[PDB]
């Protein structure tokens, strides 16, 4: 499995044309603060292709 290449899965809004973001902030889907941990309603926005 080639786990090197990655992609974005969860973002708050869409991307503008010719825009690039490399932020690694936790995407919050729920209504509670994440506190920087990956628990409930909070997942990493970057995934791999394998």
């Amino acid at each position: 499995g080639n786990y090197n290449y990655l992609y974005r899965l969860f973002r708050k809004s869409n991307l503008k044309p010719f825009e690039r973001d490399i932020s690694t902030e936790i995407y919050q889907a729920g209504n509670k603060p994440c506190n920087g941990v990956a628990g409930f309603n909070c997942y990493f926005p970057l995934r791999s292709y394998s």
Binding site: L9, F10, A29, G30, N31, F40, N41, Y43, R47, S50
Partner: protein
């Protein structure tokens, strides 16, 4: 922010990881089944455990979303399919007891020999050395002895295990908002949410009882005809008016009457033309067989197979260094990977099996566009129904005459048609009542209508009245007849074989009336028909995303089970059975007993 978006995000996150985690398990299982060694078996455990732990964690975390505010049907269906906790609702000790009871029953069924009143140094187990007597031997005092020994040796210790298994299954079903284990099994047919296509759990039972109602006279005529044909070999043992004996049939349990074909034949002089002895004179191979299968499949309007399909699939037996379990399988590895694992021989049996597996291959790739939760069937019967119609259509004599297998001299004759109709009937007509009776017995056992002290009072009498089978020797309240089956020994659903046959006939008729065919239903094919074959492709794109009622109504026009293609299939056969059975007594009475 509200429930819908959170549930959608959770489903997307689960599908991102499950598609990758299940692929490893599928690939490892394929490698093991193709290359069974001492290292693949231990490699099974870690992959299976990781996948199971992830699935259970996701199922537990798929509960904070209430199933009342979800208005879209797709997300509701996905959440419901992700809500089924299975056996996790049981306690740890109770689950351990259930697991060890199931393991003990399975390992008891795996073992088991028989004792002979003659020289007892011979041991007969579930090896094919024992069923030969029940299938090929034509004398007495052997098949009956084998049946009695099988029901006496391993038929005694399966009762205490079954007594605890029933109550544990009932408790597990009740722990999952069900009335009984039979209700849990019938819940697969339960579909909620539709506009005129809603289906209820109990209605399935109602959809079963009248189905058997329309096969009373054909099955009674078949029973009378097979009894009359058996009279010649056993004039002093088979009662002309009584029920057929439990043993002396074409199966251990009488499920399949296939082995009764040589004894029950309309005309033994007919050659029963077959082209198995035709591929040697001109040159054929298994690769050519698969090529013909795929060429026929793409001749109806189906996509061409992938290049990697022919590279990752085993079509001939390995020479050396590898061992194969010798079982035809169609694996869906995942991520657009499909494989067939089977040994292909030069025989129309292997041709039919290859076409049946090819139907599964076409079906599996037909729902590749679903979020890993809808990539199944609406009901459990759709999977095996797809491969039956393709096998039937390619087996038609017209189909074999389009590929050069038959010279352009012999077109058709009535006697071979009747022989073929009878030989096909003695694989389905002889098993439908048995399946119905077993399912009903199990349903009343799990409901509680049959008390534990009267089990060996309801299993037999129904067989005397529903199946038309009478026991040769009395059985008291110490044996456990129905647990002796492999299907019964473990948690296998048996109603699937009752409905699937209907799906075998309902589709084919709808696939023949759209092909400008006006002849017999058993002589039609879907070859060289782009339109007749487009309906199945259109319907093979929903899976369990929509109720099975809607998919059926849009493929055959019948919202429920309207099963009358069988009478149109075996129409000359029924007419001939009615004609032949005139100076006889059609039916049976539940009073006679041979001994």
């Amino acid at each position: 922010s509200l429930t819908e978006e959170n549930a959608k995000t959770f489903l997307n996150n689960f599908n991102q990881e499950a598609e990758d985690l299940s692929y490893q398990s599928s690939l490892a299982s394929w490698n093991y089944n193709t290359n069974i060694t001492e290292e693949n078996a231990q490699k099974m455990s870690e992959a299976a455990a990781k996948w199971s732990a992830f699935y259970e964690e996701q199922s537990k975390t798929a509960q904070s979303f209430s199933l009342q505010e979800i208005q879209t049907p797709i997300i509701k269906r996905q959440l419901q399919a992700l809500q089924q906790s299975g056996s996790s609702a049981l306690s740890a000790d109770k689950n351990k007891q259930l697991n060890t009871i199931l393991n003990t029953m399975s390992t008891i069924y795996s073992t088991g020999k028989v004792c002979n009143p003659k020289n007892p140094q011979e041991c007969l187990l579930l090896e094919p050395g024992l069923d030969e007597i029940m299938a090929t031997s034509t004398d007495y005092n052997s098949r009956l002895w084998a049946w009695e020994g099988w029901r006496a040796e391993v038929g005694k210790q399966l009762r205490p295990l079954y007594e605890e298994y029933v109550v544990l299954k009932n408790e597990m079903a009740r722990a999952n908002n069900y009335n009984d284990y039979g209700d849990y099994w019938r819940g697969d047919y339960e579909a909620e949410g539709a506009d005129g296509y809603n289906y209820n759990r109990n209605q399935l039972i109602e959809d079963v009882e009248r189905t058997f109602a329309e096969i009373k006279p054909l099955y009674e005529h078949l029973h009378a005809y097979v009894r009359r044909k058996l009279m010649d070999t056993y004039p002093s043992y088979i009662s002309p008016t009584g029920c057929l004996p439990a043993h002396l049939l074409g199966d251990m349990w009488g499920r399949f009457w296939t082995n009764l074909y040589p004894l029950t034949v309309p005309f033994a002089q007919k050659p029963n033309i077959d082209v198995t002895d035709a591929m040697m004179n001109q040159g054929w191979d298994a690769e050519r067989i698969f090529q013909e299968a795929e060429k026929f499949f793409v001749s109806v309007g189906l996509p061409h197979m992938t290049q990697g399909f022919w590279a990752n699939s085993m079509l001939t037996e390995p020479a050396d260094g590898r061992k194969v379990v010798c079982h035809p399988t169609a694996w869906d590895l995942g991520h657009g990977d499909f494989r067939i694992k089977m040994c292909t021989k030069v025989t129309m049996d292997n041709f039919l099996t290859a076409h049946h597996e090819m139907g599964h291959i076409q079906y599996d790739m037909a729902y590749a566009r679903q979020p890993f939760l809808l990539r199944n069937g609406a009901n459990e019967g759709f999977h095996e129904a797809v491969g039956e119609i393709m096998s039937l259509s390619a087996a038609t004599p017209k189909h074999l005459k389009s590929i050069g297998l038959l010279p352009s001299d012999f077109q058709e004759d009535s006697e071979t048609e009747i022989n073929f109709l009878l030989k096909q009937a003695l694989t389905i007509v002889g098993t439908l009542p048995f399946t119905y009776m077993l399912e009903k017995w199990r349903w009343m056992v799990f409901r509680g209508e049959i008390p534990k002290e009267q089990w060996m009072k309801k299993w037999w009498e129904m067989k005397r009245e529903i199946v038309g089978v009478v026991e040769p020797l009395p059985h008291d309240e110490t044996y456990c007849d129905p647990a002796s089956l492999f299907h019964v020994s473990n948690d296998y659903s048996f109603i699937r074989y009752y409905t699937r046959t209907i799906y075998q006939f309902q589709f084919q008729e709808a696939l023949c009336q759209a092909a400008k065919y006006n002849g017999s239903l058993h002589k039609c094919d879907i070859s060289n028909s782009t339109e007749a074959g487009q309906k199945l492709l259109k319907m093979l794109s929903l899976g369990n995303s929509e109720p099975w009622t809607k998919a059926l109504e849009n493929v055959v026009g019948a919202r429920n089970m309207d099963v009358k293609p069988l009478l149109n299939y075996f129409q000359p056969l029924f007419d001939w059975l009615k004609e032949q059975n005139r100076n006889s007594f059609v039916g049976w009475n539940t009073e006679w007993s041979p001994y």
